[PDB]
RNA sequence: CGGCCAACUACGUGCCAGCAGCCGCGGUAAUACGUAGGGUCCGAGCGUUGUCCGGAAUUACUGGGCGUAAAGAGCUCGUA
RNA sequence: GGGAGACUGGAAUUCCUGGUGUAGCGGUGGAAUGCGCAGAUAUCAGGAGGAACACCGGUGGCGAAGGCGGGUCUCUGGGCAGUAACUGACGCUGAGGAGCGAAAGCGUGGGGAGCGAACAGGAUUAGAUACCCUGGUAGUCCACGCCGUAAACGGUGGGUACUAGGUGUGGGUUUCCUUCCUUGGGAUCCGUGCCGUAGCUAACGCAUUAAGUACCCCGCCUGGGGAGUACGGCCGCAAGGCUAAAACUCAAAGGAAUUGACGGGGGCCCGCACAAGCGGCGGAGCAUGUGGAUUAAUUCGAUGCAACGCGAAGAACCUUACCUGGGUUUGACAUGCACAGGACGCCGGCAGAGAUGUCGGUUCCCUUGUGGCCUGUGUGCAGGUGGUGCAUGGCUGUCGUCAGCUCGUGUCGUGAGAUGUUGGGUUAAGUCCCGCAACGAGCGCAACCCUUGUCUCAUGUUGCCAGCACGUUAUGGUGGGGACUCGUGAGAGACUGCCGGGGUCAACUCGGAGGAAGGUGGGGAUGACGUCAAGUCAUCAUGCCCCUUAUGUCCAGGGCUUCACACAUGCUACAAUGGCCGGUACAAAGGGCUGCGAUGCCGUGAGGUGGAGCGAAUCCUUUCAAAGCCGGUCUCAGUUCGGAUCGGGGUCUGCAACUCGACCCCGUGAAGUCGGAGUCGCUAGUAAUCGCAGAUCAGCAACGCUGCGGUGAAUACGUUCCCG
């Protein structure tokens, strides 16, 4: 075990806890709920890329707050999309529930998407050389990204052998806490067993 | 030790008695942390050779330390892939720690059924020069001596 | 010498053949042996080529040898085991035959480490 | 029909049965074994074995070498 | 110092003789055989004998090679320079052949001091046919002959000509500085070394003394073993030498160089690594884990550091994955395709160990198409703590919080690769400085974060109470008060900032001042590229394989707690620095709703009844401790120590304490007298010792783990040895 990880060694200086309420008897419960969301979210949306999962909780009320390099997708035109994620959350009995779907800004920038992309394109047919190189130059050409570093292991190209690469661009320091790194974990289905990809990126410091 | 020596402790005169020996021995006699104990240990012990002799018993407990206080120490010394046991000089300090190490565990064996009564006698002894403290600097000095042969390394 | 063997799963005669190779070593160690453990390990996967790993530990007055290998078979393993043991127990001896030769000795010759330094006088020699 | 050397997948088997000119392939997911689809090269032939030359500058005339890789006689005198 | 012969010198060793002279000498890492006390070793004088020739004496001379230095004489070989007088190609190489040829060895005859194969003892060792010690025969020496081999090597056949230089040194001729003393210097011939061009080479290297450029002649090689061996032959007194195969077998054997790893190689450094100390483990009893054995089963995983109070932060049932037996199969649990329905569902009765079975009571809402529920029939399917951590992801340990690991461009090399990253200094640090065919960069180091130590502003409740009032003992208890703590927000404060001295005037370093704190203040969090196919298919996920009337699933009972042993971590002791009894003082942190639970009362005590107040800076955990202090008693004993084991009697939780809980009371009173070889932790608020709390948790096997405070030492000379 070498690395803890990012988001958790920053957790209260640079980034933000992704549910926000307060419980004192209904901790547990609380909890149970949150995974059952954040579980139902995973699977039920994977065409558009899932950035991030917030929960805010208020008595009845719960906010929901997904977001999506694809919000076109997630939504109905008339709202059926939109009326199908109400009807099962209310099944969640999450009491009154009532969502906030987002847009990321520029999806290349984001470490969970870049990993989404690098495993689906592995998964196909993808080289992982390509795959790893295309994602990137592509976050390096965004005009906030400071270093990334890209990660997948496992039997890469449907060896007997497992191997471990990765590439750097840049400046990536995971020892420096001001420096914000956004990480970004997901594994790939291939034919012949499971490749994991993380991705690391730094856009400069925040005080 | 490897990058130098360490700086010491200056611990402080004793409040009773002002002088710098006595808290040595304290904290000599000293178990388990248990200081009050130790104080009391050896204020009896004192104030019982006191009794025994008639004088002061800071005087005594000097000369005790003098009559068992040693000079020369042997130590095994590693020259040319060979051990020989070499006798060597003694620091001042070395020489006191050692003194005062001795005093209080051939007190510890004695059998005057209490350790004040037995660090009591064990100084008093010292003092005439009787102690089986002042019977192992003799074996001390005895063995440096017999082995004198080596001091030249 | 006892020893005792800790095996696992299936491996009949292997403790009996490893405890009466092990315990011959016993004159070869130059010093006391405190203990000895011998345990024996099998692979289960069948593409393991050399499945069955052996391993020893003895307390030669303090001293750890330890050694380990690998085999087809107990048999094979443990004979293993005794060679790999009774080189490191050879290297091990620190005896004075063992040290004889490593001892600076040679007055004014070979440096070594703990070679006697030279007595220099405190005037250059001229 | 792994590479040399044109031409790959599936099923069966599992250090077996077997293959193999060399390197080497068989350890329940074999493009190297067996069989089927597909393919390639030849074609009234196609392969195997035996033998000779070539590749081999590997007996070097063309066209090699001898300090440490094999290779300067232990050193001289002197006959053809 | 080229060879042969003859004669001869001195030092030293050995022995013999004679003085003086005593009790050891000799030998080794350490000793013992051995010598000596019958006079040794030591010292002095004399004598005999043999062998080798210190200083000169070297990378210096001579010889074809082997090789050759005490001195003198005799005989003798070669080389070099100059003059060039003489002959006039008379040269070179040389198969076979002949001669010479270290040491060892062989023959015959001498000699024999020292040394010394063999051989004897001594020692070391598990064993020593060895290394080491004491003796010691051939041999070593001479004469005359055999042998004919060597790492006989420059691992380089002989002859000749040509191809940059620089610098030592040996022999000889000569011009010019000129003292002409002087290696003055030059030129030239002949040797002998070093460094270096061009060129050559796989590279290392060679390089006018070629391994370069060429010509003449000779010897030899044709993959590695078998094998320089067999057979035959020749030579030899013999040992043996020379010439010299094949069968068979392998897919290599080799040379140079590169990167690692390693060394009982060197250098420089570090770390409780050693040393200096303190306390332990190993001996006893018990708790816990493991091995082994046993059993129906003792579920599985973890095996040096880095497994073994580990997964387990809680095995009576459950857990539970194992065993015996009893049931069940679209299943204990999902979702879909169909047929039939209004019931599913509960509630009581009986049977059963229970699962389960059976009986009696209750019965859907949409809305006409059917949806929610189940029934069976099904059918897809579920379901595996089944296998493989050597197919995987994720997570983790470890080297190691060590300072290291790399990349772009450039340059060098045929290439693997190298440089940067090395050198001097410095640091905790690849930290920095100065240099430098390198210039930069990345991950690491450091900093940014938390906590702790000082102060300022803000701040007063449930927290303080200094100054005022009411208090009744019972106290901040109460009205009030910011003053002092404290609680939690903001900030300042340590930056070598300053001074003095060392320092390349550079890093850095020493000391001082100021300050709460001085030199990354203390402690955390943070773990580079990788390694060990390290651990984990049993948290989870997962490729492939396997089971599917079962390896799935339900239930009762049992097991995971078995015990002749072995290992590991702990606790309690073996006592007076103590046991026991009475009084008495000081903490922090944390926890609490179907939880903490007070006063009171009832029990001797676990405890019972009861419920105040508390989601808690408020109440409860008592107002909070124990070691501590004071007083009494015990008087060195297997005890007033020690508490194991066992008998009896209880309490609580729980459906249920038999296997198999904790606690209380009475009695019982084991081993144990400070623990072998060996081994562990710790550098200061640390070790040692004392108590308190939390998680898991109905209860607890908790002496375990994670925290909190109380009291509080000794020692560090220093890196030779052990470890990394």
């Given at each position: 075990?070498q690395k803890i990880?990012?988001?958790?060694f920053?957790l209260?200086?640079?980034?933000?806890?992704?549910?926000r309420?307060?419980?004192?008897?209904?901790?547990?419960d609380?909890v149970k709920?949150?995974?059952?969301i954040?579980?139902?979210l995973?699977?039920?949306?994977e065409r558009?890329?899932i950035?991030?999962?917030?929960?805010?909780?208020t008595?009845?009320?719960?906010?929901?707050?997904?977001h999506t390099?694809?919000?076109?997708i997630?939504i109905?035109?008339?709202?059926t999309?939109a009326?199908?994620?109400?009807?099962?959350?209310?099944?969640?009995?999450?009491?009154?529930?009532?969502?906030?779907?987002?847009?990321?800004?520029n999806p290349?920038?984001?470490?969970?998407?870049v990993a989404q992309g690098?495993?689906?394109q592995?998964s196909?047919?993808?080289?992982?050389r390509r795959?790893?190189?295309?994602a990137?130059?592509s976050?390096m050409?965004?005009?906030?990204v400071?270093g990334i570093?890209?990660?997948?292991?496992?039997?890469?190209g449907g060896?007997?052998?497992?191997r471990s690469?990765?590439?750097?661009e840049?400046?990536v320091?995971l020892?420096?806490?001001?420096?914000?790194?956004?990480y970004?974990?997901?594994?790939?289905k291939?034919?012949?067993g499971?490749?994991?990809?993380?991705?690391?990126i730094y856009?400069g410091?925040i005080? | 030790?490897?990058?130098?020596?360490?700086?010491?402790?200056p611990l402080?005169?004793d409040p009773?008695y002002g002088?710098?020996?006595?808290?040595?021995l304290?904290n000599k006699?000293?178990?388990?942390?248990?200081?009050?104990?130790?104080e009391?240990?050896?204020?009896?012990?004192?104030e019982?050779?006191?009794?025994?002799?008639?004088?002061?018993p800071?005087?005594?407990l000097?000369?005790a330390?003098?009559?068992?206080?040693?000079?020369?120490?042997?130590?095994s010394r590693?020259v040319?892939?060979?051990?020989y046991?070499?006798?060597?000089?003694?620091?001042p300090?070395?020489?006191?720690t050692?003194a005062?190490?001795?005093?209080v565990?051939?007190?510890?064996?004695?059998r005057?059924k209490?350790?004040?009564e037995?660090?009591?006698?064990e100084?008093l002894?010292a003092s005439?020069g009787?102690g089986?403290?002042?019977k192992?600097?003799?074996?001390?000095h005895?063995?440096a001596?017999?082995?004198?042969a080596?001091?030249?390394? | 010498?006892?020893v005792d063997?800790?095996?696992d799963?299936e491996?009949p005669?292997?403790?009996?053949?490893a405890?009466?190779?092990?315990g011959?070593?016993?004159?070869?160690?130059?010093?006391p042996v405190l203990?000895?453990?011998?345990?024996?390990?099998?692979?289960?996967?069948?593409?393991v080529?050399?499945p069955?790993?052996?391993?020893?530990n003895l307390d030669?007055?303090?001293?750890?040898?330890?050694?380990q290998?690998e085999?087809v078979n107990?048999?094979?393993?443990?004979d293993?085991?005794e060679?790999?043991?009774?080189?490191?127990?050879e290297?091990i001896a620190?005896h004075?035959e063992?040290?004889?030769g490593?001892?600076?000795?040679?007055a004014?010759r070979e440096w070594?480490?703990?070679?006697?330094p030279?007595?220099?006088?405190?005037?250059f020699?001229?």
């Open positions: 075990g990880n990012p988001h958790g920053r209260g200086i640079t980034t933000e806890w992704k549910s309420w307060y419980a004192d008897k209904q901790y547990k609380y709920e949150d995974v059952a954040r579980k139902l995973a699977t039920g949306l558009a890329g950035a991030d999962v917030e929960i805010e909780r008595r009845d009320r719960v906010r929901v707050d997904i390099a694809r919000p076109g997630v109905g035109r008339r709202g999309e009326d199908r994620i109400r009807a099962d959350l209310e099944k969640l009995t999450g009491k009154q529930v009532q969502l906030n779907i987002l847009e990321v800004k290349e920038s984001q470490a969970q998407l690098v495993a689906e592995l196909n047919r993808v080289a992982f795959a790893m190189r295309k990137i130059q976050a050409r965004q005009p906030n400071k570093r890209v990660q997948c292991s496992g039997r890469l060896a007997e052998m497992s690469e990765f590439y750097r840049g400046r320091p020892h420096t806490l001001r420096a914000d790194i956004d970004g974990l997901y594994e790939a291939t034919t012949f499971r490749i994991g990809v993380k991705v690391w856009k410091d005080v | 030790p490897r990058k130098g020596p360490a700086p010491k402790r402080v005169n009773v002088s710098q020996l006595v808290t040595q304290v006699v000293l178990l388990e942390g248990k200081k009050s104990l130790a009391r240990i050896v204020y009896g012990a004192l019982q050779a006191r009794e025994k002799t008639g004088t002061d800071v005087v005594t000097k000369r330390l003098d009559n068992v206080k040693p000079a020369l120490e042997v130590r590693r040319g892939g060979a051990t046991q070499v006798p060597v000089e003694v620091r300090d070395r020489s006191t050692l005062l190490r001795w005093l565990n051939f007190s510890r064996q004695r005057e209490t350790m004040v037995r660090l009591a006698n100084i002894d005439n009787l089986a403290s002042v192992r600097r003799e074996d001390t005895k063995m001596e017999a082995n004198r080596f001091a030249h390394y | 010498m006892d063997v800790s095996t799963g491996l005669g292997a403790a009996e053949y405890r009466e190779k092990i011959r070593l016993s004159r070869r160690a130059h010093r203990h000895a453990r011998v345990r024996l390990t099998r692979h289960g996967d069948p593409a080529e050399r069955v790993i052996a391993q020893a030669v007055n303090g001293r750890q040898v330890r050694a290998v085999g107990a048999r094979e393993a443990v293993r085991l060679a790999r043991l009774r080189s490191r127990l290297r620190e004075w063992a040290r004889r490593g001892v600076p000795a040679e004014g070594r480490h703990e070679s006697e030279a007595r220099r006088p405190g005037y020699p001229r």
